Known about the structure:
Chains A, B, C, D, E: Belongs to the phycobiliprotein family. This is part of a larger assembly, with five copies of chain A, four copies of chain F and one copy of chain J. Chain A is mainly α. Chain A has one domain: Phycocyanins (Globin-like, Orthogonal Bundle), CATH 1.10.490.20. Chain J is mainly alpha-helical. Classes of the chains: A mainly alpha, F mainly alpha, J mainly alpha. At the E-I interface, helix 1, helix 2 and helix 4 of E face helix 1, helix 2, helix 5 and helix 6 of I. The structure holds phycocyanobilin (CYC) (9 copies). One phycocyanobilin sits at the interface of chains C and J.
Amino acid sequence: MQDAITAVINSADVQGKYLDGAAMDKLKSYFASGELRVRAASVISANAATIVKEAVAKSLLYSDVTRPGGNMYTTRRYAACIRDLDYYLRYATYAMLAGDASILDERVLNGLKETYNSLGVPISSTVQAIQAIKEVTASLVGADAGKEMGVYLDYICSGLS
Amino acid sequence: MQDAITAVINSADVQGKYLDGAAMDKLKSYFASGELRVRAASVISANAATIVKEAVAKSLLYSDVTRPGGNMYTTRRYAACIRDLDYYLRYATYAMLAGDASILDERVLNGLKETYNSLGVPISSTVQAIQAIKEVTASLVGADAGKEMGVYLDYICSGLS
Amino acid sequence: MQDAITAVINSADVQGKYLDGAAMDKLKSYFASGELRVRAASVISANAATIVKEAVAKSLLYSDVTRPGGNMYTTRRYAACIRDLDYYLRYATYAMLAGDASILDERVLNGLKETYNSLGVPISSTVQAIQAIKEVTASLVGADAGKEMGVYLDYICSGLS
Amino acid sequence: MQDAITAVINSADVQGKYLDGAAMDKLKSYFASGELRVRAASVISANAATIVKEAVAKSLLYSDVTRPGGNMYTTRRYAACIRDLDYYLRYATYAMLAGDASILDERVLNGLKETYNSLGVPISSTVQAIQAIKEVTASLVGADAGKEMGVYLDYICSGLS
Amino acid sequence: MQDAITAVINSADVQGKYLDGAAMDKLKSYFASGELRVRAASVISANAATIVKEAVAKSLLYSDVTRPGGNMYTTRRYAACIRDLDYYLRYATYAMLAGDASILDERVLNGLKETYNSLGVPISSTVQAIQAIKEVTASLVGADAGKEMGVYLDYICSGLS
Amino acid sequence: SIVTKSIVNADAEARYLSPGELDRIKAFVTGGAARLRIAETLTGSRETIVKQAGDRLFQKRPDIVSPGGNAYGEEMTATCLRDMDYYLRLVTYGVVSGDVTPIEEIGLVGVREMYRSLGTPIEAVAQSVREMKEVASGLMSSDDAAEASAYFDFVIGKMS
Amino acid sequence: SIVTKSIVNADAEARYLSPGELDRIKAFVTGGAARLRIAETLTGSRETIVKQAGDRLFQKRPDIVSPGGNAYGEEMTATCLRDMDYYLRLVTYGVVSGDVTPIEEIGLVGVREMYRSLGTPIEAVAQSVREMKEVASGLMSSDDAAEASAYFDFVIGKMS
Amino acid sequence: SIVTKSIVNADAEARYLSPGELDRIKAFVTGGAARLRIAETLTGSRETIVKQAGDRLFQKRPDIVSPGGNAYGEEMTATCLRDMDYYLRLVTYGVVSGDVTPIEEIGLVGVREMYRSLGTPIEAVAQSVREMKEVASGLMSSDDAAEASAYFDFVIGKMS
Amino acid sequence: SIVTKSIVNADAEARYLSPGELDRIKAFVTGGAARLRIAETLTGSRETIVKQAGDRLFQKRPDIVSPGGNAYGEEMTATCLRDMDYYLRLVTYGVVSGDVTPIEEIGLVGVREMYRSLGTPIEAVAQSVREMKEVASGLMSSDDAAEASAYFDFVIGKMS
Amino acid sequence: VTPRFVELGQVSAIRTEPEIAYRSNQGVTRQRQQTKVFKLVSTYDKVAVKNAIRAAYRQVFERDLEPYIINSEFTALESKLSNNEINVKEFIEGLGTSELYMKEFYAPYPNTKVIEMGTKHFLGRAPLNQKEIQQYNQILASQGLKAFIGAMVNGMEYLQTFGEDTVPYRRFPTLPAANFPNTERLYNKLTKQDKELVVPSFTPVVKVG
Lengths: 161, 161, 161, 161, 161, 160, 160, 160, 160, 209
Ligand SMILES: *[C@@H](C)[C@H]1/C(=C/c2[nH]c(/C=C3N=C(/C=C4\NC(=O)C(CC)=C4C)C(C)=C\3CCC(=O)O)c(CCC(=O)O)c2C)NC(=O)[C@@H]1C
Ligand SMILES: *[C@@H](C)[C@H]1/C(=C/c2[nH]c(/C=C3N=C(/C=C4\NC(=O)C(CC)=C4C)C(C)=C\3CCC(=O)O)c(CCC(=O)O)c2C)NC(=O)[C@@H]1C
Ligand SMILES: *[C@@H](C)[C@H]1/C(=C/c2[nH]c(/C=C3N=C(/C=C4\NC(=O)C(CC)=C4C)C(C)=C\3CCC(=O)O)c(CCC(=O)O)c2C)NC(=O)[C@@H]1C
Ligand SMILES: *[C@@H](C)[C@H]1/C(=C/c2[nH]c(/C=C3N=C(/C=C4\NC(=O)C(CC)=C4C)C(C)=C\3CCC(=O)O)c(CCC(=O)O)c2C)NC(=O)[C@@H]1C
Ligand SMILES: *[C@H](C)[C@H]1/C(=C/c2[nH]c(/C=C3N=C(/C=C4\NC(=O)C(CC)=C4C)C(C)=C\3CCC(=O)O)c(CCC(=O)O)c2C)NC(=O)[C@@H]1C
Ligand SMILES: *[C@H](C)[C@H]1/C(=C/c2[nH]c(/C=C3N=C(/C=C4\NC(=O)C(CC)=C4C)C(C)=C\3CCC(=O)O)c(CCC(=O)O)c2C)NC(=O)[C@@H]1C
Ligand SMILES: *[C@H](C)[C@H]1/C(=C/c2[nH]c(/C=C3N=C(/C=C4\NC(=O)C(CC)=C4C)C(C)=C\3CCC(=O)O)c(CCC(=O)O)c2C)NC(=O)[C@@H]1C
Ligand SMILES: *[C@H](C)[C@H]1/C(=C/c2[nH]c(/C=C3N=C(/C=C4\NC(=O)C(CC)=C4C)C(C)=C\3CCC(=O)O)c(CCC(=O)O)c2C)NC(=O)[C@@H]1C
Ligand SMILES: *[C@H](C)[C@H]1/C(=C/c2[nH]c(/C=C3N=C(/C=C4\NC(=O)C(CC)=C4C)C(C)=C\3CCC(=O)O)c(CCC(=O)O)c2C)NC(=O)[C@@H]1C
């Protein structure tokens, strides 16, 4: 896992080259975005417990998934579902702080797709749930920070896609 | 794992409904099985090492398998095969008490064929030994309870082979 | 594992007979070769650290692996290469002293191919390094004594090939 | 296989939408690159035999592979490598002209790994020959055409690695 | 842990002096006694189980200890006592081989006395059993070896007493 | 199911079924007729039992339906009664199995996460299932009501 | 084998074989003529050695041949003779290899489990091995007798 | 980078970053401008800095470049300066990242083993890094000189 | 000692020493005479060996005795010669014990940290150990020199 | 003319984006360094104790045990650990010999898979060789589950690697052979990801007898 700064450093190290103008411009872009990312992180850790509530309420409540026979019935399944949403929210916030999708490749999306397939859980409904949490987080974190959160959430969906 | 009672409970839970007569009669059947299966389990646990003893004595014993070159050769491999027979007897009586063979698939047949192939264990000799323990247990517990013991042991053989 | 003495023992024990004249002669042949094997092993152990030096120098140094971004860049990775070459030399010495190429299969080649493939280690580059090991040791322990080390390093290469 | 022009089409059609501004801009970018792509493809086709000859001269010739016993020995095998390098160059040209490296993993990389493993082909030696071809073509087609050709050849090598 | 050689080395090193004539003489004495120590250790390892058998039978069986109300009552306590005696004999043999009683010091005595005090184990009965083991093992190893073996067993008794 | 964790406990110790567990299975199989009777009596009387339990729950603690409550919506009351039905089915399954395996393994593990996510107080549903126990004992035979109230006590205490 | 044992010990510490280990292998290979002669002698008198050992064992431990004993008929005495032959062969293998790892790997690890599954008194098996040791010592030189008796005593100790 | 360390600590603790971690990242971002200025100053004088560092190192340790030494030939001295360029590039990476993590990860783990394998005196490499630090500080502000000398001293200490 | 190592290995598996271990112990006690002869040879000429090795190392490494070096001054050089005597004594202990455990326990654990605290070039210590090695090998038999070479090389490698 | 050392350190070719992505993560994953090791240095800081307990839950069970419990059933163990009456090793062993652990990683798997999961959770890597698998098999068959985790945790390897105060964590062993790839396969798949055996049994190179 590497953030934007460490990603740039590793990319420069791959060619054995110093930080050229692109290196400094990307670094300054990340430094400018750091203020927004930190404030959005504070705001999202503010409501990480509550945000997933309306994220699932408008996504996976009173539907075929929650009822018996659905893959979200039974307290273990609902608890694992809310915990999965919490994991996605926390790790996407981690990526937003780091400003890189590297963490999601190995710590979230690595083995998640076939894990869900073996579990039999509906991947498409998870996709819509992550979209719903996308709008929910965009509502609280703002537009630009909302877009930064949404790009990572869409990356999670695409990996789970 | 799961028994016949839990099997019916899961089947009624998938529909998210109460137990009906169509499950009522099948629970009556298992309850009527009852003392027969539990007599059988007690008697099987009685001389637990015995059935393994004469079963190995009549099928694999005094044969090329126990001779040099055969996979039953050497004291370590002898103990390993005997321990495998104890596994098979214990899990078969487990299934008989529970009334479902899923525990075997959940505990016995999972990877047993592949692990034996990696170890180069003769599958045919093991299946014959399990048939031996089947007939020994049938002679030791009676016809009916011997019949459930035989069906579970034959399921073990079919999954293994 | 296995060696020449254990090789003869297993050959006699697979069919269960004692040691006949042929096994006796094979054991005497191994004992005759034991002097050369012990001398070569002692010489290689004395110069084991030195050999990998010029082996890497004439086969891996100043090449694409060593440049930045190469798999042998990142000095931790250089030390990993030195350690792996030392392991190869030590286990080849083990096989030479034992006289059987069985230790390599169950202690070196076991998962090494998949290890390097998962790690992205250049297999042909490692093969060339082991070949350089063979040439260097052949010029250090003599031709006849170096023949066995060449045989076992070649076994390692073929398993890794 | 997929190219830069149909890549946008599939990307837009997976969600079922039409071609928006982003897709239009991607198509215009590919059409702008088409000039250099066509020129590079024509120049490479004109000089394919000489390119593969020069790549073989500076990467494979006068080495262990070409010596007797080596995989380059047995002139049928040398012609097989000439044919393989011609295939790699031609399919890299196909991918460069297409703008997407999907033909590489669909008509070249599909099954190549176990092919070379079964044939005992030096994978790293072939990779080195591919970088030699990349360097030769980059010094003949220019900087940007060489850029794209090196990108696709390195994709082929990474598939090999 | 320390043996005669290490004991002499440490005794010389604490004063920071080289091995003098007395240390040389002690090392020579230990080397001379090494043959007898090895023979006694081999004999004891050949009949350790029988030694414990006979010592327990002559010193503990059919006494107030083995009867109900004694410490050795119940199969669990009997097995614990037998294991204790076996470990006593084995560690005494280790000390006899090493020529020093330190291994008894930090592998048999530290915590043993107050452990027996906490569990109420009779120290006097244990001492009598160890004396029985002493004479039984003397009867096997001859007077010369039995002197050293009983010296170490009496050291164990004195520490435990 | 008594037999399911009996066998699980035996397997965890790598031993056959002990005489005590065997005898417990003996008594369970011999007395399963009463358990099936209780299953039928709970299945048949579902509507009245849930109705009276919910009404007494509402009358004891109006805050569940008071302004700002999690059940102020007319639909929220029906959702709560659906929860009542779910727990009643769980109790029926447990009394059928002779053991509390299905209650915990259908509607108990992680219920606190359930209610923190949905905001429903745990004590409120505990009181609701207490009312269920009370009305069931009212409608049930005394000896049968003993075991039914025992399982209701289990669910209320463990979920409390 | 001594080479295998030393190699395993060195590999455990992740180091090349020490000079003492190399000296041990060199001495073993140099002296291998005596070990090969010992194995040849043991294999040569195998029939008489096993016959005398079993005969002396049977009057030494009549229970194994007594009614109710494990080996009552001539058929079971055949199994006793076969087991004693296996152990003599294992002793010869250890003698030639110079180390007890072949013996332990072939017929010592889990031997108690085998003789428990067969009902055989392991103590009497140890006694039979001891009788074979005595009869072998009667058919060898003092130093050769001691060299064979080392592995015989190892087998006896592990058995008992 | 402090960002990656904070993320790793949070993930290992399975929590969002605490307020203090957020302030630490905030101050890191604020000082990123000065850190980038320092990195640009170091990068702009790479060739010069390596020239004086190598010249002063060879003045202090003439044996390494003398005949028979590790760095005798012109190619060997070029390889010395290549290693020196590598280490200064790593120092620039660390200054950009604000922590010595990239320096340790790419060029400080197992460096002792590498230079022992190559026969290069590790103390001489540390002296070369010290010359690097001195010459770089000679052309930087005092505060920036100290900020870069922190990473330079970290590399020197790890080499020593 | 090899006896201590064998006892530790046996206690690790909770088994009596195998016949191979007893044979190795017997060989070690037989060779104890040669071990003691080598130890006496090393101890008799300890002062001359230490003095010659110190002079040779000073000739190779004048910096340590150069101004500003660790060993500058008569007392500092005397302390270094005392350290050389200490390591020669440790080598003698390893020779008599037949292994390297006493050397590792006394003067090879934490030696790097200790000398880094003292500001001593560890490479200079390794070179001094080497010089002591050649000095001892010159005045001692070929086989004795080879046997002591193992301990000297172990000390040198631990230094380096 | 460019300086010679620049050319020596200069990388050949252009090093396009695909090679950058491939070679940025080339060898062992950065998770070997991008992880935290929990040591209960002092018992006076209750927050640190709770963090260590949660880490132990996440390690042994691979997850936080929120959606898998009725209540906190390890409360007594947590109190004893926070009271400095037991070590972190004792807490880990108690978590191993708990009904929750048996329900999770013992009930739904064969004893070979049980050995795999136990070695992956407490020891931190995959089983070394066939002898270890055999030994754990006899332990499981003769004494059940509790003796298995007891033998693993109280072994010399656990004390030398994790000790009495360090929570177990995923390891990256070099030796023995195939231990590293087996451990990588064990830890590269999520909990309940799939059911086949990553290391069913080491195929013997030599068939003794
Ligand atoms: C002069 C008499 C003729 C001539 C020969 C020539 N050959 C090469 C180079 C190579 N020749 C071979 C041939 C073989 N390799 C094989 O494995 C087999 C038998 C199975 C054959 C026949 C190869 C592979 C090479 C190149 C690789 C290598 O040399 O190892 C050269 C040099 C070419 C160059 O540019 O280096 C020459 C001169 N050439 C003529 O014009 C004459 C007819
Ligand atoms: C007779 C057909 C079987 C038989 C029995 C047998 N036992 C012994 C000796 C002992 N048995 C015990 C066992 C216990 N003592 C206890 O207090 C309890 C706790 C519940 C048990 C289980 C003991 C301790 C002894 C030793 C003497 C003593 O009690 O202190 C013998 C004689 C052994 C001897 O050498 O004297 C015999 C014969 N043996 C068989 O072969 C039959 C199967
Ligand atoms: C009324 C006095 C009580 C109450 C009820 C209540 N429940 C919900 C919502 C839900 N309850 C569940 C319950 C379960 N799911 C299961 O799988 C199981 C059995 C295994 C149970 C018991 C679920 C899934 C939901 C959501 C969807 C649904 O309604 O079925 C609400 C709504 C609260 C909200 O904000 O959504 C209410 C009011 N609440 C209380 O306070 C009382 C204890
Ligand atoms: C003079 C400054 C010192 C010196 C240097 C020296 N180094 C080599 C050879 C190599 N140096 C390296 C170094 C690295 N590899 C990495 O990945 C990194 C971290 C980013 C570093 C610093 C390597 C890999 C080599 C060998 C491979 C190669 O050179 O490409 C030499 C030449 C060795 C030879 O035998 O050719 C020299 C001279 N040597 C000294 O004595 C000075 C202290
Ligand atoms: C919720 C949006 C959907 C849903 C969830 C659900 N998940 C599980 C089970 C698991 N979920 C995971 C996923 C992860 N665990 C991790 O540590 C991480 C790393 C970032 C992830 C992504 C795993 C591993 C499991 C299996 C183990 C477990 O029990 O948690 C379940 C239960 C599955 C079961 O059979 O019990 C459920 C219900 N279900 C839906 O229908 C939603 C769309
Ligand atoms: C006996 C019927 C046949 C036979 C068997 C044999 N098995 C082994 C080794 C193992 N057997 C198992 C099996 C299991 N482990 C489990 O957990 C389960 C379910 C609970 C099963 C079925 C395993 C894992 C091993 C390897 C580890 C061990 O020894 O415990 C051997 C020895 C293999 C070897 O040499 O390594 C043998 C010989 N042999 C026969 O001849 C019979 C036909
Ligand atoms: C037998 C000669 C006497 C006897 C034995 C006895 N011991 C125990 C319990 C323990 N004994 C020990 C001993 C040791 N631990 C060590 O590390 C060493 C060195 C190897 C020794 C000697 C320990 C630790 C225990 C407790 C733990 C355990 O038992 O495993 C008992 C059990 C007492 C009880 O009530 O449980 C007994 C009976 N008893 C006699 O009467 C003999 C004189
Ligand atoms: C004779 C003095 C003792 C005795 C012997 C006895 N053994 C058996 C049966 C078997 N014994 C073995 C032995 C071995 N298997 C191995 O792999 C090894 C070498 C590594 C040995 C020594 C075996 C294999 C069998 C089974 C038969 C077969 O060949 O497959 C019996 C028969 C028991 C029965 O009831 O059938 C007997 C009698 N019994 C005693 O009482 C003496 C102490
Ligand atoms: C060096 C010339 C080539 C090369 C090798 C390389 N390997 C690793 C890492 C590991 N190597 C192994 C191999 C083994 N472990 C064993 O037990 C055995 C038997 C003795 C073998 C062969 C393992 C397990 C690893 C991973 C664990 C570890 O690194 O300690 C690396 C470094 C990987 C990293 O991330 O640091 C390297 C560089 N790579 C090349 O490019 C050369 C051709």
